[PDB]
């Protein structure tokens, strides 16, 4: 059974989006500037691998076209996404809900028996006063089969 290290400095898994040339170690959340400085990280601190929707955040840095989630937009509908943890490789396919601002959809873990999914979030301009990344783009991938 998967587990997210309590130690924020330890890699929890790997997220990969081949069509975007993304292969990144994933660290425990929440996705604060420090965590994203270590690497891509789960968006929330209480994130759990058994949830219907797992959220992972990454930086968007123009100075580096291929840094973390900067090139994520390169991945279109159908693109394979791999989420690897100690005991398993989960496979998902990018849906049409990609590269969209949260002000266009807005959804959380609100899912009864809906298929498992991953929400990849590009982040920029963190606001310390509110604990939120002002600039965000959402990408939703649903598990295969």
Tokens of 101: 């601002």
58, 24 in Cβ contact below 8 A? yes
Rounded to 5 degrees, φ, ψ at 2 are: -50, 155
Task: For domain 1-145, give the fold.
Answer: Sortase; Chain: A; (2.40.260)
Residue pair 71/98 in contact by the 8 Å Cβ criterion: no
Instruction: Name the experiment that determined this structure.
Output: X-ray
Q: Which two tokens stand for residue 64?
A: 């580096």
Can you give the resolution of this entry in Å? 2.0
List active site positions. 59, 123
Q: Which of 94, 96, 112, 116 is nearest to 104 (CA)?
A: 96
Alpha helices (runs of H) in 6-138, residue ranges in sequence order: 33-38
- Cα–Cα distance, 100 to 98 (Å, whole number): 5
């Amino acid at each position: 059974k998967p587990q997210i290290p309590k130690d924020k400095s330890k890699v929890a898994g790997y997220i990969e989006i081949p069509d975007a040339d993304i292969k990144e170690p994933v660290y425990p959340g929440p996705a604060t500037p420090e965590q994203l400085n270590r690497g891509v990280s789960f968006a929330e601190e209480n994130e759990s691998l058994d949830d219907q929707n797992i959220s992972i955040a990454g930086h968007t840095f123009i100075d580096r076209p291929n840094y973390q989630f900067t090139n994520l937009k390169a991945a279109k509908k159908g693109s394979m996404v791999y989420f690897k943890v100690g005991n398993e490789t989960r496979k998902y396919k990018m849906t049409s809900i990609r590269d969209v601002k949260p002000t266009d959809v807005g959804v959380l873990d609100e899912q009864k028996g809906k298929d498992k999914q991953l929400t990849l979030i590009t982040c920029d301009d963190y606001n310390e006063k509110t604990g939120v990344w002002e600039k965000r783009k959402i990408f939703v991938a649903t598990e295969v089969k």
